[PDB]
Structure formats: C-alpha cells, structure tokens
Structure 1
Amino acid sequence: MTEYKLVVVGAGGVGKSALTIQLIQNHFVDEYDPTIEDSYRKQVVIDGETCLLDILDTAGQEMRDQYMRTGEGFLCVFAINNTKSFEDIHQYREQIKRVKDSDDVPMVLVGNKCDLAARTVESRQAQDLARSYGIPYIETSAKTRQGVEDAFYTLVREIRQH
C-alpha cells in the first residue's frame, strides 16, 4: 500500500508529540517528556485510500537534516502562546527547503494549543505567513483533539497533489 513519510518539526514544547499521540493513541499526554526521536506507523483510510502513515516525531532541542531528507511532507508546528516558536518557524522551513533542494515541499503550518486563552500569536498573522509560503494553516489542540485529524489529512492531500 501507499506509504506517506510525514515529519513533525518545530521548537521544543510546542506539542509535536502530543499531536501525534492524540492522533495515534486517542489520549492527551500532559507530561514533561522531551523527544529525541520517535516514529509511529499506522494503517488508515483517507478518502477511500488505504495507506500507511509513517510519522517521524522529532526533537525540538537544537540528525535533523538526515530525517528531513527522506520526509515526503512536513507539519511545521508552533504554539499560539509562544511568540518565539512562531518566529523560529522560518528557520525550520528554510532548513527543509535547503535539505530537499526545493522551494515547494508539501507542508502545513500548525498553530497548536488553541484551547488556551493566553494567546500571543494572532490567527491573522499566522494566516498571513502561511499565505506567503503558499501552504495551508490549521489551528489545533492536542488536548481537545480539535483540528488534529485535519492537520494530518491535509498534509497527505498536499503530498497527493505535489
């Protein structure tokens, strides 16, 4: 079956693992557990297509290039309550394009932790940034599961159109 190699990247503590585990295990992890490198494989049916999602969950701690190279699509995540994680987004995108030798790689910008009230990053500025990159923007919450499937499925569809 079709296998989609997805890579989750972004600053430390934005919720990369929480989003992935919510998608794979149906539960919100409210634990301090920094990631070094973890991979998840799950069979799923998306729009009638039986496929295998091979997800690489990466570390936020500044081996990256190696895994970005094989990745077919990327979820670039930041937290809506951490301005620094939003700014860092640019550095991650630039590194992905340099490693993939392309100006256009399947990508989705993910604004996580939208269940929080203390927002420092307006949805407008994130949407504007996404528009300039030419990629979709989706707000998620690993806690309420809001937008979780949306983020991953949209990335798969982006890969299908590339």
Structure 2
Amino acid sequence: MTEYKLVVVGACGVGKSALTIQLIQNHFVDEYDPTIEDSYRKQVVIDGETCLLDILDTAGQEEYSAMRDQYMRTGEGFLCVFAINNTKSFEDIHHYREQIKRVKDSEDVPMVLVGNKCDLPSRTVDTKQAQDLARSYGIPFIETSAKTRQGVDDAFYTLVREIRKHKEK
C-alpha cells in the first residue's frame, strides 16, 4: 500500500510529540522527553485509501546536519507546528518553511500550518495572524489540541491530501 512520509517540525515545546502520539495511539501523553526523536507508523483509511503513515516526530538539532537534510529530502509532507500561546514558536515557522524548501531545493513542498494547544484560553497568536501566514504560503492552516484531539486527524489527513495534490502534477 502507499506510504506517506510525514515529518512534524516546530520549536521545542509546541506539542509535536503529543500530536504524533495522539494521532498514532489515540491518547494524550502530557510528558515526553523533549530530546527524543523517533518515527511512528499507523495504517489508516483516508478518503477510502488504505495507506501507511510513516511519521517522524522531530526534536531539532541532529548529531550531524546531514541527518536533518536526509529526513527533509525523504519526507514528502511537513506539519509546521507552533503553539498558540508561544509567539516565538510562531516566528520560528518562517525558519522551518525556508529550511525545508532550501534542503529539498523546491518551491512546491506539501505543508500544513498547525497552531496547537487550542484548548488553552491563553493565546498570543490570534487565528487571523496565523491565517495571514498560511495564506502567504498557500497552505492549509488548522488549529489543534493534542489534549482534546480537536483537529488532530484533520491536520495529518490534510497533509496527506496536500501530498496527493503535489503528486498529480
């Protein structure tokens, strides 16, 4: 079956691991070492297609930069995650967007912008500001909560749909 290589990127603390574990295992893990980087797999049906999601939960700097370049080149779509209560993590999206395009040497890379922790009333990034950024990139924007599961399937399944649209060209 088709496998989709997804990569979850974003500043430390935004909820990359929590989102991935919620997607894969259907529970909220509120404490997971920020320095652990690992891949997870799940076989799902998306729009009638039985497929495999092969998801890299990134954790930032690698032993060697070649390891980062390798996962960006092999990755097919990227969840660019910020936390709605951390403005610096939102600003960091500019860096991730650029770095992925730079490594893949492509202006057309499937991505989805994810604003996580939307169960918290505490918010420094309003939806309008995040929509502005996603509009500038021409990518979807989804607010999520790894805690409540809101938006979680939508974020990952939308990324698969973005990969499909890229492939058909």
TM category, shorter: over 0.9
**Contact 1:73–1:155 (Cα < 8 Å) also in 2:** yes
How far the C-alpha of 1:100 sits from its partner, in A, is 0.8
Matched residues in 1 for 2:157 and 2:42: separation?
Answer: 13
Cα distance, 1:32 vs. partner? 4.6
Q: 1:37: how far off?
A: 1.6
Q: Which runs of 4+ in 1 moved over 6 A?
A: none
**How far does the alpha carbon of each residue in 1:3-23 deviate from its partner, in whole angstroms, 9 at most, with x for none?**
100000000010000000001
Percent of aligned pairs with the same residue?
A: 93
Q: How many Å apart are 1:104 and its aligned residue?
A: 1.5
Q: Is the 8 A contact 1:97 1:103 kept in 2?
A: yes
- What do residues 82-131 of structure 1 show as CA deviations (whole Å, max 9, x unaligned)? 00000000001100000111112000000000001110001000000000
Aligned partners of 2:77 and 2:163 also within 8 Å? yes
Would the aligned equivalents of 1:13 and 1:60 in 2 still touch at CA under 8 Å?
no
Are the equivalent residues in 1 in contact too, given 2:10–2:80 (CA < 8 A)?
yes
How far apart in 1 are the matches of 2:157 and 2:145?
15
Q: TM-score, normalized by length of structure 2?
A: 0.93
CA RMSD, Structure 1 to Structure 2 (Å): 0.9
- 8 A contact 2:17–2:32 mirrored in 1: no
- Residues 10 and 89 of structure 2 are in contact (CA less than 8 Å); yes or no, is this contact kept in structure 1? yes
Aligned to 1:154: 158
* Corresponding residue pairs, total: 161
